[PDB]
Design a protein around this ligand. Structure first.
Ligand SMILES: CC(C)=CCC/C(C)=C/COP(=O)(O)OP(=O)(O)O
Ligand SMILES: [Mg+2]
Ligand SMILES: [Mg+2]
Ligand SMILES: [Mg+2]
Ligand SMILES: [Mg+2]
Lengths: 256, 279, 284, 259
């Protein structure tokens, strides 16, 4: 619970800082580093490791993946904050600070994303024999959740939210697409790398979907305030219902 | 070889066909409409050709390489998409047509480019057939490194951070070119070879071949703009720049000395073509 | 003893859940968002309950009837979405909220309405588990019959096409209510009866019964429309025979209706006997 | 058009006239009849009779579905030309002729559709074992084809078009939804009904999808000529390949619809 999700955010942050080493040229990695860690953590990575240990796997087995997921999140987070001149992207009041410039952020975001797969492909232990198929599947899962049918898709629609005049049904979708898909991907991957069977992988995959859709739903509440509870309930019900001990009923701590 | 253009034209078609299939219109329609706009824009398709040629070079089969071939074009397309953005080069045109962000806005341009980059890996991981997962994953790692901060992006980052300093040396110029240009060519040729069942030795020659012709392009391109800021001529003079180009072309062609004369013909041909262009 | 308020309150919950689930948000968003807006806005779920009750009554269970149950409420919804449009009634309130076209535009409303009509057939055809193919098809046919040119749509067109005819005989007015209102309630009970394994006679008996609370539900629609407030309701006989002689008739039907249920064991009929009186006696 | 296809189309009109008969209340059946044949003819409907023969079975078997497919289309046609007072949909030039007022049109279209399924449910022959299974599957293809992720998506997105200032890609998507989806349905349904086998169905389906889209673009040509022969051929092509594996005096006719 409390300090468990901590050792997780830590073991992940550590693995990232051990992998993104500022060096020549400090102009490239100077940003690649700052932006990778300047991005808020995403529950998706946490959920990735948690799911692994749940199915019985060793945390490290899904560390490259969890790292891969934060990178994709990070890269996307940066890009959704780039200042645009044509005003095609509505101005989000939570204006984050920009150390580096628009050209360096954009390119760094394009550098971070592939680094995730590098780590993945580059973490295949040739001594282990299921490592190949399990990672190839995870690369599919991750790239597919960060692609045009997933995250990208949520980022796009989000720009259609008029605030004071946008139903909750719509927002949930944007949240399902912006976070849900990624979180789904998260638990799903943690289970695959874990060695879980199709039965579990799916169940953990559904939980994540609802889990991520609920989390980002919480993010949204901040701004517009049609903060219904008949939606927070529906989701957690379906989330919990997707659980047929602790780790087996701890994932249900984010829905309380 | 006979009919080098016909060859490249064939490769381009087979590839354009596959690209159309790979990226179909769908919801959200603007994100995809943007992707196709730059991707199916019809071009030379050198990278996709380098990939397929490299595969067939080692008894590989074009079919097995088509997904990765498409993948490298997706990255190129998206690099060019972001490249034309206001915060960067800011170009309103490209090949006589409005640039991507001008047609769909900056937000879509950005996102769709991102969509092409991640899809690049998806398509390769899930569409590639006729090779063991160990090979595919490996190939994915290689694409990854070719476009990250030790490849494409590395080159494009130093280049934007260099427009300020006007005192660039051959060292600084060659880095920008190896990363912003040869990196992706290196990837392409390496993907084809791995998926083709190429020995590590073979894979290594091809990696070099690519680097030579990668550099070769920027040099010859610098020579031409004179026989028609930093450049190979400002640094070493035309005469010398040419010397380099010939060395580059000579070396590249040696890397292919041992593969079959016939299967190597296309690359040798692309090498010369890069050296003896009038534009 | 039988607790109607509860039986119905839980049947409605079960029904609202299945609905909410059958119609999820998905590309194209606005179209689906329009579908959910009118459908899950919450009604009384009178029709879907009739289906479920008729099914359980003859032997089967809710699970088997839920899809068709949800379907009839889908078509019932699209019918209201279309009745409110400018070319029709041009209304601004429905289920206590701005009309669908008012909220999404005349274009979306229609397309979202046509979607519900069509989706009702897909759902019943592909989601009904626990009934042989021929039976499912049969039901699809009955629902089609009950909402077409010899059913619901028929009542609605004859209705608008008689805007003038100040001769309004009790046969014209009988035809309208029978199709514009009774038609779908009849289909609801029938889909249920058949899907549960009901003998031709049980379907016949439930049909005639549904038919009864048909001319009834509407005689009420009229009495509630001409007594309640535009705010209580959330959105004709009481004209030719007055608002008083309309309550002397509405009874005859209620009984004549429950007389049809004597075919079944009074214990099993409790829901229908009941659901029949919430129809004769309700506040909207 | 071509003689073969006009003959099939004629049959469907006859079958439809046999099925739809003006009668009291004429206030209802008058509009239901006129509007049925007022809608343009669709190849997704005749494609069902043809596709059926190609796999073996007889046409008469698919007549019910082909009829429903036209009716679901008719309904959609009437609705997209509905006079919308609030300028919801871009009031387009079309302005076709309207015999009946908005209300009766809106409503009859809602009466056209269910009738498509009535014909199907009633087409069930007692002397057939599979009848219930194919007619159930077809009812699904049709309802889905006519669904919110089918024809309705195409109609929805179509409004988003602004004269000659919209890409070929977008327009091609619209035709794929508005026309391809239904056409593909008609080749499948026909196949299914004919008793065909998956691999065949799937193909005929893909064929229809492509043929349907090509047909859409062909009528989206006059709307604004710019459809280079590339998009057409790309489609023209794409469909034929699918047909690889169907031989006969019929199998070549199908190929004629796109050539
Ligand atoms: C538009 C048409 C065909 C109207 C006639 C049928 C009718 C009286 C429906 C009202 O249903 P309801 O009173 O149960 O409304 P709700 O479902 O909102 O409770
Ligand atoms: Mg540039
Ligand atoms: Mg540029
Ligand atoms: Mg009204
Ligand atoms: Mg109303």
């Amino acid at each position: 619970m409390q300090p468990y999700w901590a050792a997780i955010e830590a073991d992940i942050e550590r693995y990232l800082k051990k992998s993104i080493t500022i060096r020549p040229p400090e102009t490239v990695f100077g940003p690649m580093h700052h932006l990778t860690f300047a991005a808020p953590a995403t529950a998706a990575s946490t959920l990735c490791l948690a799911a692994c240990e749940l199915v019985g796997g060793d945390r490290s087995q899904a560390m490259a993946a969890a790292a891969a997921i934060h990178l994709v999140h990070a890269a996307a987070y940066v890009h959704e904050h780039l200042p645009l001149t044509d005003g095609s992207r509505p101005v989000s009041k939570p204006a984050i600070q920009h150390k580096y410039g628009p050209n360096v952020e954009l390119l760094t975001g394009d550098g971070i994303v592939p680094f995730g797969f590098e780590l993945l492909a580059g973490s295949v232990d040739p001594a282990r024999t299921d490592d190949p198929d399990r990672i190839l599947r995870v690369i599919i899962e991750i790239s597919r959740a960060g692609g045009p049918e997933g995250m990208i898709s949520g980022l796009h629609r989000e720009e259609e939210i008029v605030d004071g005049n946008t139903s909750l049904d719509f927002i949930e979708y944007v949240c399902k697409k912006k976070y849900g898909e990624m979180h789904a991907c998260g638990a799903a991957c943690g289970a695959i790398l874990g060695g879980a069977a199709e039965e579990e992988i799916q169940k953990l995959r559904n939980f994540g979907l609802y889990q991520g859709t609920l989390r980002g739903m919480m993010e949204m509440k901040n701004s517009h305030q049609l903060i219904d509870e008949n939606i927070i309930g529906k989701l957690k019900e379906l989330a919990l219902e997707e659980l047929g001990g602790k780790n087996a009923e701890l994932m249900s701590s984010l829905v309380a | 070889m006979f009919d080098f253009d016909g060859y490249m034209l064939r490769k381009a078609k087979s590839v354009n066909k596959a690209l159309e299939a790979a990226v179909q219109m769908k919801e959200p329609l603007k994100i995809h409409e943007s992707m196709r706009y730059s991707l199916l824009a019809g071009g030379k398709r050198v990278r996709p050709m380098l990939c397929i040629a490299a595969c067939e070079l080692v008894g590989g089969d074009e079919s097995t390489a088509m997904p990765a071939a498409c993948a490298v074009e997706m990255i190129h397309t998206m690099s060019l998409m972001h490249d034309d953005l206001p915060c960067m080069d800011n170009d309103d045109l490209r090949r006589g047509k409005p640039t991507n962000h001008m047609a769909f806005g900056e937000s879509v341009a950005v996102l769709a480019g991102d969509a092409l980059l991640s899809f690049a890996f998806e398509h390769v991981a899930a569409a590639t057939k006729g090779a063991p997962p160990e090979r595919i994953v490996r190939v994915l790692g290689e694409l990854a490194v070719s476009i990250g901060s030790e490849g494409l992006v590395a080159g494009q980052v130093v280049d934007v951070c260099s427009e300020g300093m006007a005192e660039v040396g051959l060292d600084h110029l060659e880095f920008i070119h190896h990363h912003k240009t040869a990196a992706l060519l290196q990837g392409s040729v390496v993907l084809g070879a791995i998926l083709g069942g190429g020995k590590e030795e073979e894979v290594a020659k091809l990696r070099k071949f690519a680097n030579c012709i990668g550099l070769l392009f920027q040099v010859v391109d610098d020579i031409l703009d004179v026989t028609k800021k930093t450049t190979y001529p400002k640094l070493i003079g035309v005469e010398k720049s040419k010397e380099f180009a010939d060395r580059l072309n000579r070396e590249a062609q040696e890397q292919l000395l041992h593969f079959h004369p016939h299967r190597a013909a296309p690359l040798i041909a692309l090498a010369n073509y890069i050296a003896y262009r009038d534009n």
